[PDB]
Design a binder for these strands. Structure first.
Ligand SMILES: [Cl-]
Ligand SMILES: [Cl-]
Ligand SMILES: [Cl-]
Ligand SMILES: [K+]
Ligand SMILES: [Mg+2]
Ligand SMILES: [Mg+2]
Ligand SMILES: [Mg+2]
Ligand SMILES: [Mg+2]
Ligand SMILES: [Mg+2]
Ligand SMILES: [Mg+2]
Ligand SMILES: [Mg+2]
Ligand SMILES: [Mg+2]
Ligand SMILES: [Mg+2]
Ligand SMILES: [Mg+2]
Ligand SMILES: [Mg+2]
Ligand SMILES: [Mg+2]
Ligand SMILES: [Mg+2]
Ligand SMILES: [Mg+2]
Ligand SMILES: [Mg+2]
Ligand SMILES: [Mg+2]
Ligand SMILES: [Mg+2]
Ligand SMILES: [Mg+2]
Ligand SMILES: [Mg+2]
Ligand SMILES: [Mg+2]
Ligand SMILES: [Mg+2]
Ligand SMILES: [Mg+2]
Ligand SMILES: [Mg+2]
Ligand SMILES: [Mg+2]
Ligand SMILES: [Mg+2]
Ligand SMILES: [Mg+2]
Ligand SMILES: [Mg+2]
Ligand SMILES: [Mg+2]
Ligand SMILES: [Mg+2]
Ligand SMILES: [Mg+2]
Ligand SMILES: [Mg+2]
Ligand SMILES: [Mg+2]
Ligand SMILES: [Mg+2]
Ligand SMILES: [Mg+2]
Ligand SMILES: [Mg+2]
Ligand SMILES: [Mg+2]
Ligand SMILES: [Mg+2]
Ligand SMILES: [Mg+2]
Ligand SMILES: [Mg+2]
Ligand SMILES: [Mg+2]
Ligand SMILES: [Mg+2]
Ligand SMILES: [Mg+2]
Ligand SMILES: [Mg+2]
Ligand SMILES: [Mg+2]
Ligand code: NA
Ligand code: NA
Ligand code: NA
Ligand code: NA
Ligand code: NA
Ligand code: NA
Ligand code: NA
Ligand code: NA
Ligand code: NA
Ligand code: NA
Ligand code: NA
Ligand code: NA
Ligand code: NA
Ligand code: NA
Ligand code: NA
Ligand code: NA
Ligand code: NA
Ligand code: NA
Ligand code: NA
Ligand code: NA
Ligand code: NA
Ligand code: NA
Lengths: 237, 56, 73
RNA sequence: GUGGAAGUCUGUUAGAGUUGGUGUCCUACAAUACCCUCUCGUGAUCUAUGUGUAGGGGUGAAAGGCCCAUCGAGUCCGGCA
RNA sequence: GUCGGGUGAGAACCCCGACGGCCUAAUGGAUAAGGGUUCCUCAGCACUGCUGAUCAGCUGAGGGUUAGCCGGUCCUAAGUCAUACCGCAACUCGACUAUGACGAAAUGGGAAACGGGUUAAUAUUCCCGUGCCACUAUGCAGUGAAAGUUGACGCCCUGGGGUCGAUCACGCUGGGCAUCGCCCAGUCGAACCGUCCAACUCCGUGGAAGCCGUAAUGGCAGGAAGCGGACGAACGGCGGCAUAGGGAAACGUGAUUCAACCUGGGGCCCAUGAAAAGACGAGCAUAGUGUCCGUACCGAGAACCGACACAGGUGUCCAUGGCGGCGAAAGCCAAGGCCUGUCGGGAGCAACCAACGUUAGGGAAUUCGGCAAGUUAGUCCCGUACCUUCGGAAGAAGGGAUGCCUGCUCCGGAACGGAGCAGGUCGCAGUGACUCGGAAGCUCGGACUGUCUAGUAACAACAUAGGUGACCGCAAAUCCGCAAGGACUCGUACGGUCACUGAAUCCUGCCCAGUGCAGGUAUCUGAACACCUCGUACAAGAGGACGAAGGACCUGUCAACGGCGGGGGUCUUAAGGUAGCGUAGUACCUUGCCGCAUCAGUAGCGGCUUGCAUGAAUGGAUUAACCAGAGCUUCACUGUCCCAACGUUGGGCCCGGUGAACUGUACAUUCCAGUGCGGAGUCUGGAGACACCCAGGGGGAAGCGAAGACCCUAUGGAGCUUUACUGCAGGCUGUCGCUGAGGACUCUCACUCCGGGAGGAGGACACCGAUAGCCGGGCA
RNA sequence: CGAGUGGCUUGCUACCUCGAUGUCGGUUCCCUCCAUCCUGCCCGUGCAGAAGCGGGCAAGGGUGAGGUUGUUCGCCUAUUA
RNA sequence: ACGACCGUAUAGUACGAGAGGAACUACGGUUGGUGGCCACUGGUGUACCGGUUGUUCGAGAGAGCACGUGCCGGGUAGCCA
């Protein structure tokens, strides 16, 4: 047949790429030698086109102007600090170690110095739980218990823009507008509504998948569709 | 809209033009590559064996 | 509210658009001062027409159940 | 009362589309045209130019649609008598 | 188009005049692309031109495009290339990363030009006048100088400022008309230099506890109004420009509404609305310099694309000319353009045809079906059902009004704005043309706007929000690449990938036996390397031991593929159809039976319903709104019909000119019968038949058109499928190499990742190379 | 039970055409057949009459409008010689 | 180039217990078909005459355009049913 949609994707053509040239900033934690004396004043609050969440503009003591992953409750004028000796307040970044347990954190680093990887979407937050001299246990927004190096930096507070998922799109047009700001081909045509040549579920005189939907992990691209390596399906039991 | 006559009217774009190298009107001004001599793509002159019968 | 939606979309969809938009448009207490002049500027962005405090909050509420938890700890 | 929202309504505004007449045409004005009728017309809108994606590959709100009158695998030449 | 006339050997169509018309977002003006000399002049008619030609976009010869201040040029956009690096057997191939360059002529950004005159043809380019910018040099000023501002920005609503235009009042100049006193045109004057400043913001004063303010929101003791001040707009006003220019002349003044242009206020976003060069910041004189490329013409029913002088296709600006009216609508008319959507002459002009008007009585009887046509119609007042998601339904339906003339009232600053009143009065008719919905009900489907088969399908199909399941913590899941590498991703579970269902509302039963996916697994099975035995002076080889994923086996899972019967009062094979719906877009029997409705209803609707073979995200039921979707009924309407007629325009017919094509074995005036490979103008027998020509509607030539699409056949082809055959990618897994120190473990030095670095994490694993076993229509 | 006629149905066959003889139903317009539905002339009767039933000659003329259905067919309504 | 039907007189008669109920013949009309014709009725009648809306020719008068009559009203001849 013909390569399915998922395969056309990888090629990275225009249709599948994210509008990078329209993106604001690669939100990452600042780099500090040590000391912590690094602090700055929030100069403005902006809209991040890549995340549909607000982002804060900050002007640092040493003159550097940069955008930062804004947690909820950060306004113009506020003073944020980043370093080992940073005060424990919302909007301040410091290695998990210096952070007191039981405090909601966002924009957590995977490996210390990576500038933040986990918990960065609208309204989410990681939960710092256990400390040590070797491991800092954080509970990510997916509920998973992640064992991190206490040296990994992180920002205090939940990510701004919480509750975005609460309101429905209502109409196709609204989706259209949001979709245009991401690396996604939209709308979505069902496999079952295509020709056999185009997708493994295509064909037939009526719309129904050929074989069962649960495919194996070892299935090749072009064939891995439907419910991937599903451990179970449905809602019963 | 017909793919024939009605779709011919929008054809006012310039692509292939007189080539600086070989002189043929095959220099695609948008690709900046000559379809006849290979100018713009190859230092060597575009030339294939299939441009003639195999035993010739 | 969802009156602009006419007879389209259905109950739930436009019922929740109204509720969310109703609370979104309410007078909100300014964190800077304490005045009821906080309005939405965009997605997650709020500002007081009184003191000009431009800050971050929820997408449709200047404060979310999660942000309120932060303070406590 | 004010306000003036809306994939909101009427609309041959511009513009876009193409339901019926199975009308006219059917060695045509035209290798997809003419007329009347009809649909949309602030939006997932329409459009010019520039630019990207290439042949078992693109592109596809999916009709096996479209990729220069060429598509259930374009076109040219070669394999080839 | 017509009548005159001009030129000419020749004139319906070349030119002048008159009369008559056509085009009004275009048939007018300016342009992009594209064309490429088509532009102008002279000379021509062999070619081209749907006829003719003295004409021409044709033929021939000449001529024609003038720039510091219009474009290009410069900048950067999506993105492109070149070099370097790396890959590759290799390259004219290939992703990344560096660097450089490229990338905008209407329509992104951007130093600067206006007015008049001139030519057969150019013109912000030449000429006259006036102006402006940049650089450089000289001189004076200045040491400030880079922080900042600008360039520079979305969608919707809206105020204020305000020019052109249009209109009104009055005056002046010129014209028109001739029962009046009306009607038309003009009444000009730039760039630039100077000056004015409303809005916004801010400062001083002031001191509001209820005031201030708006079209609206709104503002205030954190200091409202008022008062004074700073900063500060137009392509705008004002003065110069200008006893410049232009006009035969006068060479006006006020007003309203105000495109342009200027400046504010509000609202929206699961959408956030370029960048860079440059400019400002940062004075003035005088002088010099400002090169290079484009510049004609068309820009379309003859200059472009479509083989054509093609009824097609083709972007931008003029959206403010008048009446009209809600209007950038109709209809009519200016300015401007045209009679070239380029063959004519003749016949009350027949038949027949294309468009179309009107038809008495009847009124859908026509037909698959009201197909076609018609009805209705603008505006105001009254009034408006079922149902409903309370939005809607709804212009429901139905009823009334509607002109002109006289004189008025109200709203408003006013309009040449709007709303009314009284009286008079004409017609068959007052939205008098034009413009301008027919209405109501039942059922089916899809919720809705949207999408689609360019060229027979616009739909119930696709999409959608909504619902649901699945995978993944990011050195991820998914996907692309042979590799170097890459998309998702300036992204991080409120994410994004992969699928199913398809708004809302009420719901979504039972089944894990098979198949699929996933987890587990004592035991069984399970490859190669290494190891052991036999064998061979070695080797091939035979066997053994160990045993990964995988399988067996066990468990989980159906909003996973799917299943939900037969029999009797269990059996196959797990369960045995629950809510619902039901003769269905699913019901064979079938026009099922009953009812509604009609004179009569295989239709439609309702009820029943044992359902050949309904049924729950293969989603079931249901549903307001919506619909060029399928079916039915009613009112209204009508040439659809009874049943046809008359008329209108273009053809048709005759004449001048131009001038194809399809088709043609031959013969051919046929007809009735027969015969024949059973469907004969041509054979046989008879009949009929004087030749030629005009018009006609198409009976025959199994008419013309197409080596039949249907069917079969060929050890034909292709696309597609799968538990067909065979293989190939890919994934998983063991082993070997990289690979190191001390059946489970520690370490660090390779190697990998994180970190700017220091250093951190991991670590002999992973990556990569090689091989083996499993899965493997993803592909051949 | 027996003997036939027709060539409207259906079946059978594979003669004719696959370098194509355009489908069903309908419509329009022309000719025909008789195995006669009506009309004319007759015979019989379980022929009083009236109305019928059966038969004979006979193809001159006529044999119409509608409701469901694409239907042919058929069912149904009112008219009708 | 004519086919067929209804009605009246026959006749409430013949026949018949009654109920019911004919015919020959002569008449009048209807229907279908056919040929022709236009005094009459009706249609058309972009001949013509009038009314009137919009706009343009200054008003008036008188006109053009509004699809080949702007629309409305009446309509001669002819052609027609
Ligand atoms: Cl989303
Ligand atoms: Cl130019
Ligand atoms: Cl305002
Ligand atoms: K055949
Ligand atoms: Mg990042
Ligand atoms: Mg996109
Ligand atoms: Mg879909
Ligand atoms: Mg399909
Ligand atoms: Mg497939
Ligand atoms: Mg389905
Ligand atoms: Mg399905
Ligand atoms: Mg094509
Ligand atoms: Mg709309
Ligand atoms: Mg509309
Ligand atoms: Mg494009
Ligand atoms: Mg198909
Ligand atoms: Mg010329
Ligand atoms: Mg000449
Ligand atoms: Mg450039
Ligand atoms: Mg420009
Ligand atoms: Mg010129
Ligand atoms: Mg010019
Ligand atoms: Mg022409
Ligand atoms: Mg009539
Ligand atoms: Mg009927
Ligand atoms: Mg009928
Ligand atoms: Mg119709
Ligand atoms: Mg009317
Ligand atoms: Mg007043
Ligand atoms: Mg039905
Ligand atoms: Mg729909
Ligand atoms: Mg089509
Ligand atoms: Mg449609
Ligand atoms: Mg269509
Ligand atoms: Mg659908
Ligand atoms: Mg969904
Ligand atoms: Mg979803
Ligand atoms: Mg029924
Ligand atoms: Mg279920
Ligand atoms: Mg053949
Ligand atoms: Mg076939
Ligand atoms: Mg094959
Ligand atoms: Mg790295
Ligand atoms: Mg295959
Ligand atoms: Mg034939
Ligand atoms: Mg007989
Ligand atoms: Mg006969
Ligand atoms: Mg006229
Ligand atoms: Na299928
Ligand atoms: Na209100
Ligand atoms: Na059409
Ligand atoms: Na191909
Ligand atoms: Na060949
Ligand atoms: Na000025
Ligand atoms: Na007007
Ligand atoms: Na001519
Ligand atoms: Na719409
Ligand atoms: Na099962
Ligand atoms: Na199973
Ligand atoms: Na089922
Ligand atoms: Na639609
Ligand atoms: Na008619
Ligand atoms: Na014929
Ligand atoms: Na095929
Ligand atoms: Na026989
Ligand atoms: Na037969
Ligand atoms: Na043949
Ligand atoms: Na037929
Ligand atoms: Na007869
Ligand atoms: Na019938």
């Amino acid at each position: 047949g013909r390569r399915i949609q998922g395969q056309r994707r990888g090629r990275g053509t225009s249709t599948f790429r994210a509008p990078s040239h329209r993106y604001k900033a690669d939100l990452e934690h600042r780099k500090v030698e040590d000391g912590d004396v690094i602090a700055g004043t929030v100069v403005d609050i902006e809209h991040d086109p890549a995340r549909s969440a607000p982002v804060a503009a900050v002007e640092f003591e040493d003159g550097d102007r940069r955008l930062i992953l804004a947690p909820e409750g950060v306004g113009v004028g506020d003073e944020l600090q980043v370093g080992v000796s940073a005060e424990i307040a919302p909007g301040n970044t410091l290695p998990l170690a210096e952070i007191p347990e039981g405090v909601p954190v966002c924009n957590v680093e995977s490996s210390p110095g990576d500038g933040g990887k986990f918990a960065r979407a609208s309204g989410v937050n990681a939960q710092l739980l256990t400390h040590d001299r070797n491991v800092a246990v954080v509970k990510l927004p997916s509920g998973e218990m992640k064992r991190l190096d206490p040296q990994c930096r992180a920002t205090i507070g939940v990510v701004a823009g919480g509750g975005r998922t609460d309101k429905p799109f209502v109409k196709a047009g609204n989706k259209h507008h949001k979709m245009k700001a991401r690396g996604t081909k939209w709308p979505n045509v069902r496999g079952v509504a295509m020709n056999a040549v185009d997708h493994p579920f295509g064909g037939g005189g009526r719309q129904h998948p050929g074989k069962p939907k649960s495919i194996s992990r070892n299935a090749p691209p072009g064939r891995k569709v439907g419910d991937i390596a599903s451990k179970r399906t449905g809602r019963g039991g | 809209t017909g793919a024939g006559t009605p779709s011919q009217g929008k054809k006012n774009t310039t692509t292939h033009t007189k080539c600086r190298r070989c002189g043929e009107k095959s220099y695609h001004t948008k690709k900046k590559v000559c379809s006849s001599c290979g100018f713009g793509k190859s230092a060597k002159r575009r030339d294939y064996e299939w441009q003639s019968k195999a035993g010739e | 509210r969802s009156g602009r939606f006419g007879a389209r979309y259905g109950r739930v969809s436009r019922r929740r658009v109204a509720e969310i938009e109703s609370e979104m448009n309410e007078d909100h207490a300014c964190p800077n001062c304490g005045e009821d002049r906080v309005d939405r500027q965009g997605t997650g962005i709020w500002q007081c027409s009184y003191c000009d405090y431009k800050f971050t909050g929820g997408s449709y509420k200047p404060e979310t159940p999660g942000g309120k938890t932060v303070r406590r700890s």
